[PDB]
Design a protein around this ligand. Structure first.
Ligand SMILES: Nc1ncnc2c1ncn2[C@@H]1O[C@H](CSCC[C@H](N)C(=O)O)[C@@H](O)[C@H]1O
Ligand SMILES: Nc1ncnc2c1ncn2[C@@H]1O[C@H](CSCC[C@H](N)C(=O)O)[C@@H](O)[C@H]1O
Lengths: 361, 378
């Protein structure tokens, strides 16, 4: 399906055979470089927007985009080989197009658009990844020698946050099922705090699921603007508010039934993480919950499941961009304890775990 | 498996379900960026050589390599997540180490070392891949409009040729099995021409398989130097020779029983490809064979098999580096016909296909004469 090596043709177990087999497997990993390069170049050239507007043969698309015809065929067939675009082959030749699901992912301004991820890679991640050895040499450390938090800046998040909206629906449906099995129902009011809310999608999907709930997102000015616009598109604006500014300044509020941290703790240092956890505990209502949605692994750091394997890789993505980590269950439990909280649930999602915690006293 | 997404937790019915599912699959493809970055950084830092010398925990490796302890933990655990390095468990914890098979791939100077591929990526391919958009805009067409061959240069091949040695053994095993099944044997004299031989591994492995054969490798002088050294390493130097120079000149000799083109045609334009095929036919014994080993796909260009999917991607790798293609079976058949050859076999290998061609047996359906000549010139 995805394989680039016909492994059925790598046979034997002599030392030579095993070395050759490993070399092919390592080469296949190395050529994983090619997929973001192809996809991100296609984005830069306007390929996806053009295919959505009108399906096209490769020569026609090259003319429309002022590109070389042969190179465009090569690029389009590579995108088809990655299952990113569709292609019809009949007696008239080839026509390239987007499926509805691909359109949602590849065009700007849709709910699940990956354009912000493409742009994050182009502008931030790809130059950093080429310098990874330097950061490993020197450490993700500040001028005083202390661990630094992750370095992705608010202006970079303006793109990236929309590009990670796709994570939210599986996470929110898993969380919502558990909250309903926890006696939290529709028709009862509750207040949510979404710390570092990004576009606000996690909050906004909760608002759709729980029609009497309200939610408040904390994020920086320009991100809060994005989040309010998205709430309006989703029809939950009357129950979604933002509180713009650096969340380290406080002004979070109190009485929250749910405090959500999605994709926040991996940005922290241990010192900043424990502070955030204590802040969260202080704003909880009686019977409130903290939900951490993150790349979380056991201290053994064994890649036993896809979520564990992704967490170990995500830690490298954090180091690449200046700090943070994929923290361990044991670390979260330490932070919970320090904040007077106790972990009560762990739920798996496609690429994350949800940890739920509540006040012990 | 080695998936990075737990796809059992993604639904796929509604339009929103399916968009979310595709976005996770596309994201998984995008984060393929991270693996070469981690592996190539580890090479630059000396990780693989150090682990081969002495297995160590992250903190010990950080000390030995003058790196930060936490960042080294992050790097090594990522390599472990990619199955590139292993663990050995002690009563007090574990160390990282390389398996025997991984050592052969990750250390410099071994026969199957990927180091030359790491360095090709670092020096050439990484920066090119981020400029891919501008190369698609302009194409490989020269100032006069004609397509250019691939632009990877001799200085680049000094690293890359050793870094692709790993492809050769499965290919040579498959080729040799077909040669023997067809009647060839190693206790009779035969001559092989290896055009653009690189390190010479393909013809050197053939020389080990067929102990009375000889082989001549064609390449530029700095690569021929590598090939002669490797022939000595493999014990076949008495039957392996090189001829340095631009192989597009032709005049390759006479009487060759086998003319091998491994990883050559994808570098070509259609014009240079047909010229090479004609040079091959001109040097072939009456019963000789041409073997093309390349990224080859049907004209339907459908990603049905791994080899098809890799070929379509490899075409992009050629465009990335200035020219060439993953050519189709039908294009090779054009070139065989233009050279008086006929395809007789197609064989699959892990990431390639082998085409075998012999001298044609039947004449063109168009009789000799001016009309045939005019068709030829057009
Ligand atoms: N000190 C700080 N104050 C406010 N927002 C912050 C912050 N540090 C990080 N953030 C915000 O935290 C978010 C991290 S990305 C995650 C966004 C969202 N929770 C999601 O999972 O999709 C960004 O929107 C970023 O601007
Ligand atoms: N015009 C030319 N004349 C001579 N050698 C050339 C050439 N163009 C390319 N080459 C050589 O062709 C090789 C291409 S890489 C393939 C090497 C080998 N056949 C293998 O498959 O491993 C390089 O060694 C390069 O130096």
């Amino acid at each position: 399906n995805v394989s680039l090596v016909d492994e059925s043709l790598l046979v034997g177990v002599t030392d030579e055979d095993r070395a050759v087999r490993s070399a092919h497997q390592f080469y296949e990993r190395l050529i994983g470089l090619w997929a973001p390069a192809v996809m991100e170049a296609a984005h830069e050239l306007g390929v996806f927007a053009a295919l959505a507007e009108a399906p096209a043969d490769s020569g026609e698309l090259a003319r429309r985009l002022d590109c070389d015809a042969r190179a465009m065929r090569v690029l389009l067939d590579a995108l088809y080989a990655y299952d990113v675009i569709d292609r019809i082959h009949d007696t008239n030749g080839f026509r390239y197009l987007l499926s509805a699901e691909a359109r949602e992912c590849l065009l700007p301004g849709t709910l699940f658009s990956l354009v912000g991820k493409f742009m994050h890679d182009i502008n931030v991640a790809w130059p950093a990844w080429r310098n990874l050895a330097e950061v490993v040499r020197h450490g993700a450390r500040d001028t005083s020698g202390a661990e630094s938090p992750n370095g992705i800046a608010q202006e970079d998040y303006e793109s990236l946050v929309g590009g990670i909206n796709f994570w939210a629906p599986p996470i929110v449906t898993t969380l919502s099922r558990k909250l309903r099995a926890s006696g939290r129902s529709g028709d009862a009011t509750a207040s949510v705090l979404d710390v570092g809310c990004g576009t606000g999608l996690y909050s906004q999907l909760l608002l759709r699921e729980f029609p009497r709930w309200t939610a408040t997102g904390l994020d920086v000015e320009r991100i809060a603007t994005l989040a309010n616009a998205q709430a309006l598109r989703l029809g939950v604006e009357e129950r979604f508010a933002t509180r713009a500014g650096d969340f380290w300044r406080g002004g979070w509020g109190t009485g929250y039934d749910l405090v959500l941290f999605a994709n926040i703790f991996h940005l922290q240092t241990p010192a900043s993480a424990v502070r955030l956890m204590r802040h969260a505990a202080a704003c909880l209502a009686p019977d409130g919950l903290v939900a951490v949605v993150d790349q979380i692994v056991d201290a053994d750091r064994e890649p036993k499941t896809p979520q564990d394997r992704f967490a170990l890789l995500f830690a490298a993505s954090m180091t690449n961009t200046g700090g943070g980590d994929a923290y361990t269950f044991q670390e979260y439990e330490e932070w919970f304890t320090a904040a007077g909280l106790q972990r009560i649930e762990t739920l798996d999602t496609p690429m994350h775990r949800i940890l739920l915690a509540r006040r012990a006293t």
